[PDB]
Amino acid sequence: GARASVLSGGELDKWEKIRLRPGGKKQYKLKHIVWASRELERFAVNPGLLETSEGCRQILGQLQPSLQTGSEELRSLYNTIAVLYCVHQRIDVKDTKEALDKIEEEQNKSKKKAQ
Amino acid sequence: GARASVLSGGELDKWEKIRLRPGGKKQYKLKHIVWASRELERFAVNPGLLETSEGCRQILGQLQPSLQTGSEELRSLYNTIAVLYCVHQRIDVKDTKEALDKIEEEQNKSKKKAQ
Amino acid sequence: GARASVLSGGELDKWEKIRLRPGGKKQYKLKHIVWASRELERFAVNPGLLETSEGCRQILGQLQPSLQTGSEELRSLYNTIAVLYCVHQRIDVKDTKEALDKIEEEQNKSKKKAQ
Amino acid sequence: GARASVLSGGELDKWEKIRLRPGGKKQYKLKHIVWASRELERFAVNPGLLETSEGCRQILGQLQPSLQTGSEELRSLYNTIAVLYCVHQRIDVKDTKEALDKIEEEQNKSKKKAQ
Amino acid sequence: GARASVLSGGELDKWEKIRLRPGGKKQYKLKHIVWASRELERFAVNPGLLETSEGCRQILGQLQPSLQTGSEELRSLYNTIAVLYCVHQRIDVKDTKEALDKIEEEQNKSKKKAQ
Ligand SMILES: *C(=O)CCCCCCCCCCCCC
Ligand SMILES: *C(=O)CCCCCCCCCCCCC
Ligand SMILES: *C(=O)CCCCCCCCCCCCC
Ligand SMILES: *C(=O)CCCCCCCCCCCCC
Ligand SMILES: *C(=O)CCCCCCCCCCCCC
C-alpha cells in the first residue's frame, strides 16, 4: 500500500502541500515523519502506529497533557502526528493551525459520547 | 507515514508467508502487486484504492459478478485484492482460503443488513 | 550474604535452565538482566528494585499502561521482568508464556480486593 | 527584571544560603540549577517554566508519579525543583528538610481547599 | 533557569515586540530597564521591585500623584513601568497607549474590590 501512498493523488502527495503557521512560507517534507519514528523509538513506542488512524489517535491522546510542559520540539512532534491524522482521515488542510482545528472539532464530537 | 508494512509481522511479511492454495508450498511474491497494478492500470482505476481497504472492496465488488466467467488469472487478481484487504485489516492469514473466508464474512455481514 | 546467590537450586542456577521462547533452543542468560538494569537509567528507575519481588512488581506496574503502544523492546523487558518475578517468588515456569499467565493470575486475584 | 534578583534578599541570594542536606557543611550553588535544567531539557521539558511558580508546580507534578521507583538522581532533581519553588515564593528555608516540611504542609493546606 | 526571561517566548522576547509610540517605528529596548534601575538608585529606592509583577503594580500606585506635575522623563518612566507590568503578565502590547489602557482596565476592577 506504501507503493500507492507515493503516487500523485495519494497521502504522501497531500503531505508536502501543507504550511507551517497560517502566515508562513515553509511546508512539510517526507523526512518529518521519519523523524517522528525516530522520536517514537527514543520514547519506546511502536512506529507502526504512525501508519494507522487508530495508532495516530492514541499517540495524540498520550502527547496531549504534556504539550505546554514540553518544549516546542515536542509540540512539533505532536503537530506532525496531528497533520498525519488529518491526511489519514482524507481531509485537506492548508496549514498546521487548520489541522489542529480539525483535531479540536473531532475532540468536541468525541467528548459528548465518551461517558 | 508507512512504517510497519515493510517489517516482520507486517504486510510484506504476511504476503511472503501466505500460501497460493491451502497446502501449497508456494507463497505470494511481490511481483503480483506490480501485476495487479498493471491490470488496474489497464482498467484505468484510481491508485488510492490500494491505499485503503474500502477501495479494495470497490475493486472486489466489480470483480465479484465476473469470477465464474473468469480464468484462474482473473481469479488470482481477486485473491490478490482479497489478501491485500485482509492484510491491511491486520488479519493473521496463513493462506488464500482464510483470506477468502474473511471476505465472505464481510459479504455475509453486508447481506445481513441489506434488508 | 552475596555468596548464597550462585548456590545450586538457587535463583541464578534456575534462570539459565528456562526457555526464552516456548518452541526454541534459546535459554535465558545473565546478560539480559545486565541490559535490563542499564535501561532502568533510560526509564530513570532505581536498579536496587531488581533485588526484591516487590520492586520487580513495581517495575511491572510502571510498564503496564505502556504495554499495548510499546515497541518490541518494551515487551521484551516486561516479559523478562515477569520471569524474574516468578524466579524470585520460586515458581517453576519452563518458558516466558507460563510467567505471563502467572503474573496475570496474581493481578486477577488482587482485582477482587482492590475497590 | 531578572537582573534585580541578584540583589541580597533576591532569588540568587536565597538559593545559595540553603543546605543540601539536614547535616554536612555543603550548601546549594547556582551550578546545580544548570544540571537540573540540563536534565529537564534532556527529558524535553520547556525552560520557560523555570521562572514561574505555576510552571514549577507543574514540574513537581510531572516528576511525581515516578518518585516511587525513581533513581537517586531523579529524586535529587525533584528535591532541587522543590527548593526552587520555595525560593520563588520567598520562603525562608535553611535546608532541603525545611523545604520538604513546608511542601508537605502546603499540600495538606492545599488539599483542604482542592479535592 | 533565569535564562527563561531572555528565551524566545520569554518576557524579554516580548519586550522588543512593543513600539514606543503609536506613530513611531522605534521599539522598547532593554536599556529602558537599566535606566529605570539607575533612576531608582538616584532617588534612593530599592531596585528589587523590578523583578516582580507586584512591585511594578505598586510603583504605578506610588507614582500616580507624581504624574500630574512631573516631567516628560517622569511620564516616560511611568509608561516604562506600565509596560513592565504588562510584560510580567506576558502581554503582547502594541504600544504605550495600549499599556496604559491595560493598567486602567485592571484598576477599575481592582478599585471596586481592594477597598
Ligand atoms: C503496498 O502497495 C504494498 C507494496 C510493498 C511495500 C512497499 C514499501 C516501500 C518501497 C519503496 C517505494 C516503492 C514505490 C514504487
Ligand atoms: C511516511 O510514509 C513518510 C515517507 C518517507 C519515508 C522515507 C524513508 C527513508 C529511509 C532511508 C534509509 C533506508 C533505505 C535506504
Ligand atoms: C550471607 O551473609 C550468608 C548467610 C548464611 C549462609 C547462606 C548460604 C551460603 C551458601 C554459599 C557459601 C557457603 C560457604 C561455606
Ligand atoms: C531584568 O532586569 C532582567 C533582564 C532584563 C533585560 C535582559 C538582558 C540580559 C540579562 C541577563 C544577563 C546574564 C549574563 C550572564
Ligand atoms: C538558569 O538560567 C540558572 C542560571 C544560573 C547562572 C549562574 C551559574 C551558571 C553560569 C554558567 C551557565 C549559564 C547558563 C544560562
DSSP D8-20: TTSHHHHHTTSBS
Alpha-carbon distances of B3 from A14, A27, B17, B89, rounded to whole Å: 18, 22, 19, 15
| Distance between CA atoms of residues B110 and B103, nearest Å | 11
Alpha-carbon distances of D61 from A66, B112, D33, D91, D107, rounded to whole Å: 11, 52, 18, 20, 12
| Distance between CA atoms of residues D3 and D5, nearest Å | 5
Count the alpha carbons within 13 Å of E65 in the hemisphere toward its beta carbon.
1
Under a CB-based contact definition with an 8 Å cutoff, are residues B21 and B95 in contact? Answer: yes
Q: Chain-centre distance of CA D14, in angstroms?
A: 12
| Distance between CA atoms of residues A9 and B47, nearest Å | 8
DSSP letters, A34-72, are HHHHHHHHHTTB-GGGGGSHHHHHHHHHHHGGGTTTB-H
Query: How far apart are the CA of E52 and the nearest CA of chain D, in angstroms?
Result: 7
Q: Which three cell numbers stand for residue C82?
A: 515477569
User: 3-class DSSP state for residue B24?
Assistant: coil
Under a CB-based contact definition with an 8 Å cutoff, are residues C70 and A44 in contact? Answer: yes
- Closest among D33, D29, D17 to D95, alpha carbons compared: D17
Task: Give the A window 64-103 contacts with D, CB below 8 Å.
Answer: 66, 68-74
Contacts of C40 in chain D (CB under 8 A): 71
| Distance between CA atoms of residues E105 and E91, nearest Å | 14
Q: What angle separates helix A72-88 from helix A53-63, to the nearest 10 degrees?
A: 150
Nearest-by-Cβ selection for D49 from A66, A69, A74 = A69
Residue D111: CB atoms within 10 A of its CB come to 9
Q: Which three cell numbers stand for residue C96?
A: 516466558
Q: Which residue has the cell 523492546?
A: C73
Q: What are phi and psi of B95, to 5 degrees?
A: -145, 180
| Distance between CA atoms of residues B37 and B84, nearest Å | 12
Residue A88: CB atoms within 10 A of its CB come to 20
D56 burial class (0-12, 13-18, 19+ CB within 10 angstroms)? buried
The response to whether residue E40 sits with its C-beta less than 6 Å from ligand 4 reads no
| Distance between CA atoms of residues C93 and C99, nearest Å | 6
- Which residues touch E70 (CB under 8 Å, ≥6 apart)? E63, E78
The response to whether residue C4 sits with its C-beta less than 6 Å from ligand 3 reads yes
Under a CB-based contact definition with an 8 Å cutoff, are residues D83 and D99 in contact? Answer: yes
- Cα D5 to middle of ligand 5, angstroms: 13
- The answer to whether the CB atoms of E7 and D33 lie below 8 A apart is no
C-alpha torsion sign, points C45, C50, C54, C59: positive
User: 3-class DSSP state for residue B86?
Assistant: helix
| Distance between CA atoms of residues E38 and E29, nearest Å | 15
DSSP letters, D55-86, are HHHHHHHHHGGGTTTB-HHHHHHHHHHHHHHH
- The answer to whether the CB atoms of C74 and A41 lie below 8 A apart is no
C-alpha torsion sign, points B67, B72, B73, B77: positive
Query: How far apart are the CA of B52 and the nearest CA of chain A, in angstroms?
Result: 8
- The answer to whether the CB atoms of B5 and A4 lie below 8 A apart is no
| Distance between CA atoms of residues A20 and A82, nearest Å | 13
- The answer to whether the CB atoms of D58 and A69 lie below 8 A apart is yes
- Cα C10 to middle of ligand 3, angstroms: 12
Q: Which residue has the cell 492548508?
A: A94
Q: Which long-range contacts (CB under 8 A, 24 or more apart) does E104-111 make?
A: none
Resolution (angstroms) equals 8.0
The DSSP bridge partners found for residue C45 are: D70
- Cα A6 to middle of ligand 1, angstroms: 8
- Closest among B100, B8, B41, B92 to A4, alpha carbons compared: B41
Contacts of A5 in chain B (CB under 8 A): 1-2, 51
| Distance between CA atoms of residues D105 and E3, nearest Å | 30
